Amino acid sequence: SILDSFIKHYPDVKLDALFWRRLFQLSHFAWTPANDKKATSVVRCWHLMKQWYASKRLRPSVDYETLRQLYDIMKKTGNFPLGIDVLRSFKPGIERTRAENAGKVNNIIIKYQKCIIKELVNRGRFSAVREFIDSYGFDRKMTKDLNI
Amino acid sequence: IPIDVHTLKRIISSSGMDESEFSKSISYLFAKTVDPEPKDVLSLEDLSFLLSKLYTQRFQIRRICRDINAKYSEFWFKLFSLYAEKVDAKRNQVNLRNTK
Amino acid sequence: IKHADKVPHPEEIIHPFYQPTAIEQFTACATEYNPSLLDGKKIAPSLIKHPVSLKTILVDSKLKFDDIRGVNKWLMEFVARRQHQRNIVL
Amino acid sequence: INPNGLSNLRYFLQKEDFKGANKIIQSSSGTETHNIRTLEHVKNTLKDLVGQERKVDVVQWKSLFDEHSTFLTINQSAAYWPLRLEYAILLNKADPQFYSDRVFLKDYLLLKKSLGQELIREDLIALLEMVLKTQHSSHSYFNLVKQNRVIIRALNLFKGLQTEDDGSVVYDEVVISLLLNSMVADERVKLRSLYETIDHIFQTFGDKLTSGMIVSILQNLAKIKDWNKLLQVWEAITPTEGEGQDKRPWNEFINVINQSGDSHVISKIVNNGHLLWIRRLNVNVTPELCNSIKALLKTAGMENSTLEEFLVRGT
Amino acid sequence: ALENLLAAINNRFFPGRCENSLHPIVIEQLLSYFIKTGNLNESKNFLGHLIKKGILPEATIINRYLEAIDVHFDKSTKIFDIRSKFAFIADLAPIIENYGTIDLFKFLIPMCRHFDELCSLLNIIRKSNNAKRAVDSTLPIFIKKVLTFTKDPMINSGNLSTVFNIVSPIYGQNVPSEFVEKFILSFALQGNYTMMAHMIDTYKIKLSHKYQLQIIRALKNSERNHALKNTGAVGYNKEFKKYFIEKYLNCTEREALRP
C-alpha cells in the first residue's frame, strides 16, 4: 500500500529489475503453503510488473529461480496446470538478447523444459532455433500407457 | 591484467606465507602489470592507484580463488598492513597538522 | 520460417586479402537498420556450422547484422585477426 | 557571345518569362570565360529570389541551368564546383520537397564522383548542415531512422578508395561531431547505434583522440542521460592511464555535469568513486577549471574542504 | 609405393602429427611432388603446415599450386565456382599482401567478385615494390573484372576514376600510351566524357585517327548499350556530347563516319 500510494501520487519512477526480484523473494517468504496452497503473492506481483506502465519492453534476465520454485508446485491457477500459467513469463525475453550463452540463465532454460508434460500436440513451440524437441519423453510414456 | 593465469594466484597464496618477502612480491605485481616503472620498490601513490584496479578485478580473482578462499583474506590483510604503515610513515612527518 | 542466414564469427570466414578499412567499419557501426558487410553481397566463404550439420560447411554468407549490439566487437575481432596475419613474416 | 548576359537576365528572371529569359542565355556562349558567365551570376539572381521568398520554381530553375550546362565549365571544375554547391544548397533551402536530400546526392555527390574530381572534405559538412536543416514526416523514432539511412547511403558513395582522403573525413574533426548530433536529437528519440558508434570511436580513434570528439561525445551523452555508460567511457582511457598527463577534458566534464546534474548521480559520482584520479595522474588544473569546480561543488556536495580544496593543493 | 611409404612412416613414427615436422625443404619438395601428381588435399595440408613453420615457398612452386588448382576443375569461373575455389587460399593469406608473385595476383584478379573486394587488392599492389610489373601484367584482366561488376554507369564511372587517381602515383608520370588507350577504350563506354577530354590533353597521345577500328567500335558499343544503361544520359546526352563529338574527329572518318 505504501509503494502504491507513492507511485499514484508521484510521477513514474525507474522500477529496476532488482526491485521486482527482491519483491518476488519477499513474497516467496511471505506466502505460506500450509495456510494457503495457492501462491497469490507471487502471481499478483508478477501481474503487477507485467502491467507496470504496460511493461514497456520489460524483458530483463535476472535468473528467476523463484519462478522455477513456484513451478515445482502445480495446479495453483485458473488453468489446470500452474506451470503453463507461468509459461506466460516466456514471452518477455524470448529473444534472450543479453542471455546469449553461458551462466545459469541458459542452464535454467534447458532446465525449464520440464514444464512440458504428457503426450500432446505442441506445435507452438517456436522457442528458439536449434531446439532439442526430440530428446525428452516418448518411450517413457507410450510403453507405460500400453502396459496399463 | 592485474589478475593472471595462476600467477597472481600463486603470489597471493605466496610460498606458504607472505612473511617480509611480500613487499617485493607486490613490487613485482605492479611491475609486470600496467605501469611497470622499474625505479622504486614501494610508493604510496602507486599502491593507491593499484588498489582501485584490485577492487575492480577482485571479482574475478575471488572466482578463480574460490576453491582456496583461505589465503585470500590474509593477502588483503597484508595489503592493508602495508597501506597503514605507509600512512603512518607519512604521519610522522608533520606537514599538515598531525594526523590528517 | 526458413533460416535467417545468421552471421558467423570472423574465425569461420576465410579470406586472404580482405582488409576492412576504418571507413567501412564506421559505416557498419553507424547503421541501425540491418547493418551488413560488403553490402550484403553473399560473398564470404565461411567455415560455418549449420545447426543440424555442424561439419564446418563452407558457404558464402550475407554478413548482414540482424541486430546492432556486438557488431563493433565483430569488427575489432576481425581486424585484429587480419593485422595478426599481415604482421607475420616468412 | 551575347554581351547582354548577366546584365538584363534578372529582370526577365524575376518574372520567369521562360523563353523570354532563356533567349539571352541561349545567345550567350563561346569561350570558357563566357561559359563561366553563363553559369555565374545565376547564383546571385537565385539568392535575390530567396530574398523575395520564392520557392516554387525548383524544376524550372533546374531545367534552366541544366540546359546550358557547358563542358568548359566542367573543364575548370576546380573553381566551378563551389558555384554548383551554392546552387544546390540554395535549391535545397527552397522547397526541399521537390529537391530532397537524395536529389542533392544524385545531382552533386554522384556526378562529381563520376566526373572523377576529388571530393573536398567540406562536402560532408554541408551535407549534414542541410540534412539537419529540414526533417521529413513520420516523427515517431523514424526521422532518425531515415536520416541514418540517407546519411549512411550518402557516405556510402566513398566506401571505395581514398579519393585523395588518406586522412579520411572520419579522421577529420567536426564532421563526426555534427553527424553524431544529427543522428540523435535528444532523449525523446534515441537510436540503437549510439553505443556502437562511440565505442568504435574509443577503440580505434583513441590513438588520435582530439578534444573535439571527446567533448561532443559527452555533450551528446548528456542529452540521452546515459550516465551508467557515460562513466564507463570516461573511466576508459586508450593510453595507459594518464600517459602524458590526462588527455580527457576534465573541465568539460565539470561544465556538462553542471548542466542538468541530477542530485543522486552527482552525489554518487563525487563521493562514490569516479574522482581522486586527478591526484593519481597529476594533471594541471586550470584556474578557470578550479573556479568551475568551486561553483559545481557549491551547487554539489561539500564545497568547503573535502573534494573542493582537495585535489587542488594536493590535500 | 610412395603413398604406402608415407602412410607407414606417419603411422609408426608418431600418429599425432604428420610429416610436416620434417625439414622444410623436404616439405617443399613433397609439395612439388604432390602438385605434379595433382593431390590437392595433401598439397593444401602440407602448404598450410609450411606456412605455420615460418617458411616462404618458392615462387615457382606457388605458381604450380595455382595451375594445379586451375586444372583440377577445368577452371571455367562461374557462380558455382569461387567458393569451391576457396578453402585452398587460407594458408596463402600471409603471402598475399606481404610478398606475392605476379601469378598470384593474376590468379586472384578473377576471384574478386566485387569492386570493394579488389579495392584492398589494388591497395596492396600499390604498397608492393613489384607494383609496376604486376600492374603491367594484370591491368587488362583487371579492367575486364571491374567492368563485369558495376553495370550502372555512375558507380562504375566513380570506380574507374578512383582506380585512375590511385594508379597515377604508379609509374609516376608518362604512363605508357598502351595503358592510356586501353583505359580509354574501357572508359569511352558509359560516361565521364569530361575526364577523358582532360586525359587526351594530359598526355601526348593526341591521336584522333581510328584506333585500328576500336574508337568507332567503342562509340558503337556505347550507343548500343545506351538503350540498356544511361538511357536518360544526364550530362552524357547529345545536347551535351555535341561539343566533344565535333572536337576530336580525324579527317579519315567523315563526322564519326556519319553515325
XYZ file of N, CA, C and O in Angstrom, chain A residues 17-132:
464
model
N 14.890 -3.939 -12.333
C 14.618 -5.366 -12.204
C 14.928 -5.871 -10.801
O 14.290 -6.815 -10.326
N 15.900 -5.255 -10.124
C 16.210 -5.654 -8.755
C 15.011 -5.434 -7.843
O 14.702 -6.281 -6.996
N 14.321 -4.304 -8.004
C 13.123 -4.050 -7.214
C 12.134 -5.201 -7.341
O 11.654 -5.742 -6.339
N 11.824 -5.593 -8.577
C 10.870 -6.676 -8.785
C 11.407 -7.995 -8.241
O 10.662 -8.766 -7.624
N 12.694 -8.269 -8.457
C 13.263 -9.533 -8.000
C 13.222 -9.639 -6.482
O 12.847 -10.683 -5.938
N 13.602 -8.570 -5.781
C 13.517 -8.582 -4.325
C 12.069 -8.689 -3.868
O 11.773 -9.356 -2.869
N 11.150 -8.042 -4.586
C 9.736 -8.166 -4.252
C 9.274 -9.611 -4.380
O 8.536 -10.114 -3.525
N 9.701 -10.297 -5.444
C 9.342 -11.703 -5.610
C 9.875 -12.542 -4.459
O 9.157 -13.386 -3.908
N 11.138 -12.329 -4.079
C 11.712 -13.094 -2.980
C 10.961 -12.831 -1.683
O 10.643 -13.767 -0.940
N 10.646 -11.566 -1.403
C 9.894 -11.247 -0.195
C 8.539 -11.940 -0.199
O 8.114 -12.497 0.819
N 7.850 -11.921 -1.342
C 6.570 -12.612 -1.440
C 6.741 -14.108 -1.221
O 5.898 -14.751 -0.584
N 7.827 -14.679 -1.742
C 8.074 -16.103 -1.546
C 8.189 -16.435 -0.064
O 7.607 -17.416 0.411
N 8.938 -15.624 0.688
C 8.994 -15.819 2.132
C 7.680 -15.460 2.808
O 7.455 -15.868 3.953
N 6.807 -14.717 2.129
C 5.554 -14.295 2.744
C 4.480 -15.368 2.613
O 3.869 -15.772 3.609
N 4.234 -15.839 1.394
C 3.180 -16.819 1.178
C 3.496 -18.112 1.918
O 4.628 -18.603 1.895
N 2.479 -18.664 2.579
C 2.630 -19.863 3.393
C 1.945 -21.034 2.707
O 0.719 -20.997 2.524
N 2.671 -22.083 2.306
C 1.992 -23.227 1.673
C 0.914 -23.847 2.546
O -0.145 -24.234 2.036
N 1.152 -23.950 3.854
C 0.181 -24.600 4.730
C -1.089 -23.769 4.859
O -2.201 -24.286 4.700
N -0.944 -22.473 5.144
C -2.114 -21.617 5.297
C -2.882 -21.496 3.988
O -4.119 -21.513 3.980
N -2.169 -21.373 2.872
C -2.804 -21.212 1.567
C -1.928 -21.894 0.528
O -0.838 -21.405 0.218
N -2.401 -23.020 -0.005
C -1.692 -23.706 -1.078
C -2.050 -23.062 -2.411
O -2.497 -23.740 -3.341
N -1.878 -21.743 -2.500
C -2.143 -21.016 -3.738
C -1.336 -19.722 -3.649
O -1.734 -18.792 -2.941
N -0.212 -19.674 -4.366
C 0.751 -18.582 -4.220
C 0.172 -17.325 -4.861
O 0.479 -16.961 -5.999
N -0.691 -16.646 -4.101
C -1.329 -15.432 -4.599
C -0.348 -14.268 -4.647
O -0.433 -13.416 -5.540
N 0.585 -14.207 -3.695
C 1.510 -13.079 -3.640
C 2.389 -13.024 -4.883
O 2.475 -11.987 -5.551
N 3.047 -14.137 -5.215
C 3.988 -14.126 -6.332
C 3.266 -13.825 -7.636
O 3.723 -13.004 -8.442
N 2.125 -14.476 -7.869
C 1.397 -14.259 -9.115
C 0.908 -12.819 -9.203
O 1.007 -12.180 -10.257
N 0.380 -12.283 -8.100
C -0.110 -10.909 -8.119
C 1.016 -9.934 -8.442
O 0.843 -9.020 -9.255
N 2.180 -10.120 -7.818
C 3.325 -9.276 -8.140
C 3.747 -9.463 -9.589
O 4.104 -8.495 -10.270
N 3.709 -10.704 -10.079
C 4.042 -10.951 -11.476
C 3.104 -10.194 -12.407
O 3.546 -9.604 -13.400
N 1.805 -10.199 -12.109
C 0.879 -9.386 -12.889
C 1.190 -7.904 -12.730
O 1.156 -7.147 -13.705
N 1.511 -7.476 -11.510
C 1.816 -6.068 -11.277
C 2.933 -5.590 -12.197
O 2.810 -4.551 -12.855
N 4.033 -6.343 -12.261
C 5.141 -5.937 -13.119
C 4.778 -6.063 -14.593
O 5.228 -5.252 -15.411
N 3.968 -7.062 -14.954
C 3.567 -7.209 -16.351
C 2.738 -6.019 -16.815
O 2.861 -5.582 -17.964
N 1.880 -5.487 -15.947
C 1.065 -4.328 -16.286
C 1.677 -3.011 -15.826
O 1.060 -1.959 -16.023
N 2.865 -3.035 -15.222
C 3.516 -1.797 -14.814
C 3.837 -0.944 -16.033
O 4.722 -1.287 -16.822
N 3.127 0.174 -16.188
C 3.276 1.032 -17.362
C 3.143 0.213 -18.642
O 3.820 0.461 -19.642
N 2.257 -0.781 -18.604
C 2.088 -1.744 -19.687
C 3.374 -2.507 -19.978
O 3.518 -3.099 -21.053
N 4.313 -2.511 -19.034
C 5.577 -3.228 -19.177
C 6.252 -2.870 -20.504
O 6.397 -3.691 -21.409
N 6.661 -1.609 -20.594
C 7.271 -1.115 -21.824
C 8.582 -1.852 -22.029
O 9.611 -1.496 -21.451
N 8.545 -2.890 -22.862
C 9.747 -3.629 -23.231
C 10.453 -4.172 -21.991
O 11.683 -4.174 -21.900
N 9.659 -4.640 -21.028
C 10.178 -5.208 -19.785
C 10.632 -6.637 -20.067
O 9.907 -7.614 -19.868
N 11.872 -6.752 -20.542
C 12.482 -8.035 -20.887
C 13.847 -8.140 -20.220
O 14.885 -8.127 -20.892
N 13.883 -8.247 -18.890
C 15.165 -8.456 -18.211
C 15.512 -9.929 -18.089
O 14.754 -10.792 -18.542
N 16.658 -10.226 -17.482
C 17.071 -11.610 -17.247
C 17.877 -11.617 -15.952
O 19.078 -11.332 -15.966
N 17.214 -11.943 -14.844
C 17.820 -11.821 -13.523
C 17.829 -13.167 -12.810
O 17.819 -13.223 -11.576
N 17.852 -14.258 -13.574
C 17.970 -15.601 -13.010
C 16.846 -15.870 -12.009
O 17.070 -16.080 -10.816
N 15.616 -15.857 -12.523
C 14.428 -16.025 -11.689
C 14.252 -17.505 -11.369
O 13.401 -18.205 -11.925
N 15.083 -17.991 -10.446
C 14.873 -19.329 -9.909
C 13.625 -19.393 -9.040
O 13.121 -20.490 -8.779
N 13.119 -18.242 -8.590
C 11.865 -18.229 -7.847
C 10.721 -18.747 -8.708
O 9.861 -19.496 -8.230
N 10.697 -18.361 -9.985
C 9.677 -18.876 -10.890
C 9.785 -20.390 -11.022
O 8.771 -21.095 -11.029
N 11.012 -20.909 -11.124
C 11.200 -22.354 -11.167
C 10.679 -23.008 -9.894
O 10.009 -24.047 -9.951
N 10.975 -22.416 -8.737
C 10.469 -22.967 -7.484
C 8.947 -22.956 -7.457
O 8.317 -23.933 -7.032
N 8.334 -21.862 -7.909
C 6.878 -21.805 -7.955
C 6.325 -22.859 -8.903
O 5.309 -23.498 -8.610
N 6.979 -23.056 -10.049
C 6.503 -24.056 -10.996
C 6.602 -25.464 -10.425
O 5.813 -26.338 -10.801
N 7.558 -25.707 -9.524
C 7.689 -27.035 -8.934
C 6.383 -27.491 -8.302
O 6.066 -28.685 -8.321
N 5.614 -26.561 -7.747
C 4.279 -26.852 -7.236
C 3.282 -26.578 -8.353
O 3.435 -25.620 -9.118
N 2.258 -27.420 -8.449
C 1.404 -27.485 -9.624
C -0.055 -27.268 -9.240
O -0.443 -27.398 -8.075
N -0.862 -26.927 -10.245
C -2.311 -26.799 -10.099
C -2.665 -25.735 -9.058
O -3.310 -26.004 -8.042
N -2.220 -24.511 -9.327
C -2.461 -23.375 -8.444
C -2.793 -22.131 -9.254
O -2.281 -21.040 -8.985
N -3.649 -22.276 -10.262
C -4.014 -21.158 -11.119
C -5.372 -21.444 -11.744
O -5.993 -22.479 -11.490
N -5.833 -20.508 -12.575
C -7.109 -20.695 -13.244
C -7.118 -21.911 -14.151
O -8.077 -22.686 -14.156
N -6.054 -22.097 -14.927
C -5.951 -23.245 -15.811
C -5.458 -24.461 -15.028
O -4.991 -24.354 -13.892
N -5.564 -25.638 -15.648
C -5.346 -26.859 -14.882
C -3.890 -27.011 -14.441
O -3.645 -27.571 -13.365
N -2.890 -26.543 -15.213
C -1.523 -26.540 -14.681
C -1.146 -25.194 -14.087
O -1.628 -24.161 -14.561
N -0.282 -25.178 -13.071
C 0.311 -23.915 -12.648
C 1.472 -23.517 -13.549
O 1.691 -22.323 -13.780
N 2.216 -24.496 -14.066
C 3.399 -24.181 -14.851
C 3.072 -23.442 -16.135
O 3.716 -22.447 -16.475
N 2.068 -23.924 -16.870
C 1.701 -23.269 -18.122
C 1.179 -21.863 -17.863
O 1.311 -20.978 -18.717
N 0.578 -21.626 -16.695
C 0.280 -20.252 -16.309
C 1.562 -19.445 -16.172
O 1.629 -18.289 -16.609
N 2.593 -20.039 -15.567
C 3.896 -19.394 -15.501
C 4.526 -19.279 -16.882
O 5.384 -18.415 -17.099
N 4.113 -20.122 -17.833
C 4.679 -20.068 -19.174
C 4.439 -18.721 -19.840
O 5.154 -18.373 -20.787
N 3.460 -17.949 -19.361
C 3.280 -16.593 -19.866
C 4.539 -15.761 -19.674
O 4.765 -14.797 -20.415
N 5.368 -16.112 -18.689
C 6.628 -15.407 -18.494
C 7.573 -15.600 -19.668
O 8.544 -14.849 -19.799
N 7.319 -16.597 -20.515
C 8.233 -16.861 -21.618
C 8.242 -15.713 -22.619
O 9.301 -15.361 -23.150
N 7.079 -15.116 -22.893
C 7.025 -14.085 -23.928
C 7.952 -12.915 -23.625
O 8.654 -12.459 -24.543
N 8.003 -12.375 -22.410
C 9.086 -11.438 -22.088
C 10.437 -12.135 -22.149
O 10.651 -13.170 -21.514
N 11.351 -11.562 -22.928
C 12.690 -12.105 -23.021
C 12.829 -13.337 -23.885
O 13.731 -14.146 -23.650
N 11.957 -13.512 -24.881
C 12.131 -14.616 -25.822
C 13.470 -14.486 -26.532
O 14.233 -15.453 -26.654
N 13.774 -13.279 -27.014
C 14.961 -13.079 -27.837
C 16.238 -13.425 -27.083
O 17.232 -13.821 -27.704
N 16.235 -13.295 -25.758
C 17.431 -13.531 -24.953
C 18.611 -12.740 -25.515
O 19.705 -13.264 -25.729
N 18.367 -11.453 -25.761
C 19.392 -10.612 -26.367
C 20.633 -10.553 -25.490
O 21.762 -10.658 -25.986
N 20.447 -10.390 -24.180
C 21.581 -10.360 -23.264
C 22.040 -11.770 -22.904
O 23.243 -12.013 -22.753
N 21.103 -12.708 -22.765
C 21.424 -14.081 -22.371
C 21.845 -14.877 -23.605
O 21.185 -15.819 -24.048
N 22.987 -14.475 -24.166
C 23.487 -15.134 -25.368
C 23.886 -16.578 -25.084
O 23.548 -17.482 -25.858
N 24.595 -16.816 -23.986
C 25.076 -18.153 -23.654
C 25.733 -18.098 -22.280
O 25.819 -17.039 -21.650
N 26.194 -19.260 -21.816
C 26.914 -19.370 -20.553
C 26.054 -18.920 -19.381
O 24.880 -18.575 -19.557
N 26.630 -18.925 -18.183
C 25.904 -18.521 -17.000
C 24.855 -19.548 -16.608
O 24.731 -20.623 -17.195
N 24.086 -19.189 -15.580
C 22.988 -20.036 -15.141
C 21.716 -19.811 -15.947
O 20.788 -20.621 -15.843
N 21.647 -18.744 -16.746
C 20.424 -18.464 -17.497
C 20.127 -19.609 -18.456
O 19.120 -20.308 -18.319
N 21.017 -19.849 -19.418
C 20.782 -20.941 -20.354
C 20.616 -22.262 -19.619
O 19.875 -23.139 -20.076
N 21.289 -22.418 -18.478
C 21.181 -23.659 -17.724
C 19.800 -23.825 -17.101
O 19.361 -24.957 -16.875
N 19.106 -22.724 -16.800
C 17.768 -22.868 -16.235
C 16.729 -23.029 -17.342
O 15.700 -23.681 -17.136
N 16.969 -22.460 -18.526
C 16.041 -22.666 -19.638
C 16.045 -24.130 -20.062
O 14.989 -24.752 -20.218
N 17.235 -24.706 -20.244
C 17.310 -26.132 -20.548
C 16.750 -26.940 -19.390
O 16.224 -28.044 -19.584
N 16.856 -26.414 -18.170
C 16.183 -26.997 -17.019
C 14.708 -26.624 -16.957
O 13.930 -27.324 -16.301
N 14.310 -25.540 -17.624
C 12.920 -25.104 -17.640
C 12.051 -25.936 -18.570
O 10.820 -25.836 -18.495
N 12.649 -26.762 -19.429
C 11.874 -27.537 -20.389
C 11.009 -28.602 -19.732
O 10.162 -29.189 -20.414
N 11.191 -28.870 -18.439
C 10.316 -29.813 -17.756
C 8.878 -29.322 -17.679
O 7.991 -30.112 -17.345
N 8.629 -28.042 -17.972
C 7.262 -27.536 -17.953
C 6.360 -28.348 -18.871
O 5.181 -28.560 -18.567
N 6.896 -28.817 -19.998
C 6.116 -29.662 -20.891
C 5.914 -31.022 -20.240
O 6.828 -31.576 -19.613
N 4.708 -31.569 -20.382
C 4.355 -32.847 -19.779
C 3.268 -33.489 -20.628
O 2.611 -32.829 -21.436
N 3.092 -34.798 -20.448
C 2.071 -35.555 -21.164
C 2.353 -35.566 -22.662
O 3.093 -34.715 -23.168
N 1.774 -36.530 -23.375
C 1.943 -36.655 -24.822
C 0.767 -35.952 -25.492
O -0.333 -36.502 -25.580
N 1.005 -34.731 -25.963
C 0.005 -33.931 -26.653
C 0.626 -33.358 -27.921
O 1.787 -33.622 -28.244
N -0.160 -32.569 -28.646
C 0.282 -31.931 -29.881
C 0.690 -30.506 -29.522
O -0.158 -29.619 -29.385
N 1.991 -30.288 -29.366
C 2.549 -28.977 -29.037
C 3.356 -28.503 -30.245
O 4.569 -28.703 -30.317
N 2.669 -27.870 -31.194
C 3.298 -27.334 -32.392
C 3.572 -25.840 -32.296
O 4.086 -25.257 -33.255
N 3.243 -25.210 -31.171
C 3.504 -23.798 -30.988
C 4.822 -23.547 -30.287
O 5.051 -22.463 -29.743
N 5.698 -24.551 -30.290
C 6.985 -24.459 -29.599
C 8.009 -23.792 -30.517
O 8.982 -24.394 -30.974
N 7.763 -22.509 -30.785
C 8.737 -21.726 -31.538
C 10.031 -21.581 -30.747
O 11.125 -21.798 -31.282
N 9.921 -21.230 -29.465
C 11.068 -21.117 -28.572
C 12.238 -20.413 -29.253
O 12.185 -19.202 -29.486
N 13.296 -21.157 -29.571
C 14.440 -20.620 -30.290
C 14.910 -21.656 -31.299
O 14.692 -22.857 -31.125
N 15.557 -21.176 -32.363
C 16.038 -22.083 -33.394
C 17.021 -23.074 -32.779
O 17.677 -22.793 -31.768
N 17.123 -24.250 -33.398
C 18.017 -25.307 -32.930
C 17.665 -25.684 -31.489
O 18.436 -25.486 -30.548
N 16.458 -26.222 -31.331
C 15.968 -26.714 -30.053
C 15.812 -28.226 -30.122
O 15.342 -28.767 -31.129
N 16.209 -28.907 -29.046
C 16.177 -30.367 -28.999
C 14.775 -30.805 -28.584
O 14.517 -31.206 -27.448
